[PDB]
């Protein structure tokens, strides 16, 4: 009857009935014409939900019909009842569930696979609402770049991530882990046979999930440009790219982010020649991706104009090349429309975004657990390619990555708070509410210098703390608010204890120190209220006791590796410690 | 060529007219018999201290000093002034001309004469005086200090010393309301017993001798009754308390409502009105009554552009002659912009009195407030004619900020807070001034993280250089030169503080010893932070871990100590460095 949480939000969805229960066995129509990856995804779903396939038809049992628009299948047409994927953009699809029948029509193969993923999300306990849906992405390339420093994702993390992207309609995965010598330290060298199977597994998994596996080369460590050596090194770049092509790689990136020979003309020459001699020569390779040595607005621009390097790079690099930038800074609050317009103007095309959130390599004590935040909802005007750099913490990165999927697939309707709530609801099931209490305190990233991004920590509790100080300093009665805040702090502690006892090991292993840290702070916040109450009661012994406890809790948090809620739970203790009620 | 020395306050009008001259070891004194008595005593005190004798009979070889008031008939004074005059200046005004062996001081009144002397005292260095024409007068009529801080009281000797300091800097108001004198609050009805008489007399006499109005602060809010027979008894107690003070020589009074448990605006106002009528008006020689209403900062007084009930009623009831104090937009606040003064003064339909809560540190005692008057609108005088600051329990170090309040209130229009700050330290600390500046520069900003904050930011130039260090490092720009420069600043900080520890007089050192040790610790931690950065640039892991451990111990020592200084600068720098991972830029 009711529509389950969906992610991404589909473009068009209307409830057209009251839904029905899918029978224990079903009629499968189109299984041989439809996209193989979509059909394999469907079969895996039905198999896991104990829904058998009928070898012969039966008007009683539910009928599921699947295929592309370019297929002449009139059963699909009949089931679709007008609505079609014919005029939708790439990766788009139509889905109709109406009395005992579900029709999935992709605009293409990719689109068909996405139709299935939505279907999977619509079904609960063999029940499905009945709706009419047409859907397609706001932006063409949506995904993740594995560009963080620190402990690398394991082979199993990547495989799991790859499936998670497919399931959320993310179509891009840029493979450039700092731990793989063949992306950088041995960039010339083709993969040895002893590495071939691992790579093949990533390449295959990506393909079966409609994910573009982008191989990222950073030749900057030692590439040469001039004379015979430059020629040799260029040929090695070709050599390497085709050994990868022979494994099935069809997307490439070349990074100039870390080179010291800051020569714009030479960087772009290598890109242009690679583009001619490889990308275009092959015909089925996707547009070349690049990161220029200047890759954030502050490094790219002075006074509304490009700097020397960026001016030359933008003038030299072929228009068919995806150029990545990070926004106004490497790690920064926002990408407002005006920033995208500026950089897009300079490069005379739609840009690619490398968004350093929720990555935490620069401030590892803190987990980044908030939604996409600060990215203008009109960005698609100037951006055709959107990626996020995640944490070394693969599992917990799913919260933020989940909201990125929504932002990039349905940008105009993206609401960061509802997206954030939905991500945790869909990922954490019965522990969703407790996870929210904890994660609410861990959204803001800030290394106290050059790197800051994210939604503020626990903003509503922050507003309440502010009101307590106003009331106390204005001689107004705060007894009801003090009471409310004790409730807030007890609830922080309780939720974190719950998460400790009940979280899956795969999540708990990423966040146990931060859980303890939040508990410590909740206990200090409580002791801080005790100080205020002692001063209102003029009780010197109760004050001194609360004060030593509050101070100890704060000292524990400060010296601990884990970091959380700095401006809210932690700062509150310092505010209370410096507050002297006797002065008014 | 004798240059003009530092002067405080900055005189309204000063023109250098000659190259200056030497004041003989013996001088001719002309007018000392008709001129203001306190002014003359201040002059003799100065002459004596600088081994300058007074000629018994005229001697045409000697420097001639002529002193008097405008309405005094002295032909030598008129001749020496050569057209310059104090005749059309406001009260406390005076003229001073030093020209060719003659120094003429003409006050518009007795107070102005005294202040002419104070300027003369500042003009003379080693018997040399510049040749200048001066006409001078204050922007604001009442300038001074309220002893209104919580904490350890000023001693009797601190107060006597403060009063003399006010006289030298032309501050004419001292509001005596120490929390720890019972007769001010806990025993407000009771007149001073015989045991306390000498002590009170000394303060009153020292104030008068220094042209300082000694305001007695009464806080009856503790237990004053308003209705019926008890209300009548308490009002008569107020009257008999005030006349016992009057008999001791007190001519200024403040009555406070800041701490009363009710908000009975009409009753507060009627007590003042009646006191005004039966005492202030009746005596004829009592200055305007001073009050602090129960709501005394804009936040407590105003809601949506309009007075709150208490304020509206108090404003409606209180007599127009009464001085009403407010502290600005908050009790302890960054600024009083012109608009705030305009709003409150409009509500009260009168020129307001300011109770400015800086350099008071009672709400964050680990930090010394060593900055200038900061955030006060330079056109505030349009709406304000009474300016006081609430200082620290630390009487000696309060002089830096008070010195700047003297200059802001006497010469408001030309007040430059950086220059006033520098001049305050130069004039107070002599040979240790440059070192004192290094230290005090890290201790101007007050912030308890909640309701209270005010003052110039700590060490802003250094803060801008630290910012630029992180900009360079995160932009992969070479930072060697800046790093070297910062090593120099941190070494300077430590060396200034060590010299201060060794050479500060005990009266100053006593108040700042812990803060000195704290700045040294922070400086050492700052140096260690640089060593961390350098070790990361050199890819030296062992050098990194060793610098880091020092940085963290220095920071930890700073955080756990009572003393607080340079929170956003020297202290924050270490935390910034500890959170920065250079290995990934
Ligand atoms: C634009 N860009 C990055 O921002 C980046 C990177 N490797 C790491 N980062 C950013 C880092 O994760 C933020 O601390 N690479 C290889 C990159 O090209
Ligand atoms: C306007 N006002 C004050 O601001 C004040 C005060 N006693 C203390 N203060 C302020 C305090 O020193 C700052 O914490 N009194 C008695 C007062 O009238």
Residue numbers in the entry:
A (entry chain A): 41 to 624
B (entry chain B): 40 to 624
Text taken from the publication that reported this structure:
Recent kinetic and structural data obtained from hOGA and bacterial homologues (GH84 family members) have revealed that GH84 and GH20 perform hydrolysis via substrate-assisted catalysis and the active site architecture is structurally conserved.
To determine the binding mode of the competitive OGA inhibitors, these compounds were soaked into CpOGA crystals. Diprophylline interacts with three active site residues via hydrogen bonds. The 2-OH and 3-OH hydroxyl groups from the 2,3-dihydroxypropyl moiety hydrogen bond to the carboxyl group of residue Asp401, which is conserved between bacterial (CpOGA) and hOGA. Furthermore, Lys218 and Asn396 hydrogen bond to the N9 and O6 atoms from the theophylline moiety, respectively. The electron density unambiguously represented the S-enantiomer of diprophylline.
